[PDB]
Design a protein around this ligand. Sequence first.
Ligand SMILES: CC(C)(C)OC(=O)NCCC(=O)NCc1ccc(C(=O)NO)cc1
Ligand SMILES: [Zn+2]
Length: 225
Amino acid sequence: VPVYDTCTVPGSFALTFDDGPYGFSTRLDSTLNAANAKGSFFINGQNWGCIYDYADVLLERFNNGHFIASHTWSHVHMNQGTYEQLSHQLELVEQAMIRILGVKPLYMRPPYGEYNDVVLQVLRDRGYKGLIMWNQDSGDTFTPTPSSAQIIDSYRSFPEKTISLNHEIKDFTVDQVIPAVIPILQQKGFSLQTVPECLGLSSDPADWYVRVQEPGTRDDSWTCE
Ligand SMILES: CC(C)(C)OC(=O)NCCC(=O)NCc1ccc(C(=O)NO)cc1
Ligand SMILES: [Zn+2]
C-alpha cells in the first residue's frame, strides 16, 4: 500500500486533524465551511469519546466534502499488534462508518506515525488504498505545548504541498489556530484541499470510500460498550 506524506498538486495545502471527532468539532467544521476549506479527519472509534456519539458531526463532515479516514478504533501502537489485532482495530472503525455513513474508508493514518510491514500487509488485505503520514507538525500536542501564537507563526512558513498534522481534541487548535491560519494560507495563494485531492488522486468525495449499504438509523448497536 502506498505511503504518502506530501501533496503533489501545485498550490495545495492539507489541513489534517487527528483523534476526533470531539466537543469542538461543529465549530471547527463551521470555520472550515465558511471559507470553503476542506479538512482531512483521521478519526478514532473509542478514544476521546465514542464515534457513535459523534454521528451527526460525522454526517455533516461526510456530506460537506471533507475527507474521513481511519486512525484505528482504540488509537493503538500498531507496531505492537498482531495481524489479527490490527485487522480488528481497523474493522471496528469500518463498521461504525458503515452503520453511520453507509461506507468503508479507503485510507488511514497510524497512531503515533508508527507502522511496519504487518500494518502495510493488513491494509493491503483489507482493501486500503493508502497510508497517510504528514510533513509538518503544528506542535499542538507537544509537551510543553507551544502557544497558539507560536503555532500560527509556524504556519506562516509552511510551504505549498504541506500535509499538516493537527489534533481536533485541542481546544486552541479549533478556536485560535485554525481561524487564524485559514486566511493566512488562502490569502497567500494556497488551496485548502483534502489529502486525496492534493495527491492528485480524486477530488470526488465518493472516490475516497467504498459504499457498502444504506446508512443505518441509530439503534442499540450504536455503542462503544
Ligand atoms: C498514550 C498517548 C496516546 C496519550 O500518547 C502517546 O503515547 N504519544 C506518543 C507520541 C509519539 O510517539 N510521537 C509523536 C506523535 C505523532 C503523531 C501522533 C498521533 O497519533 N496523532 O494523531 C502521536 C504522537
Ligand atoms: Zn493520534
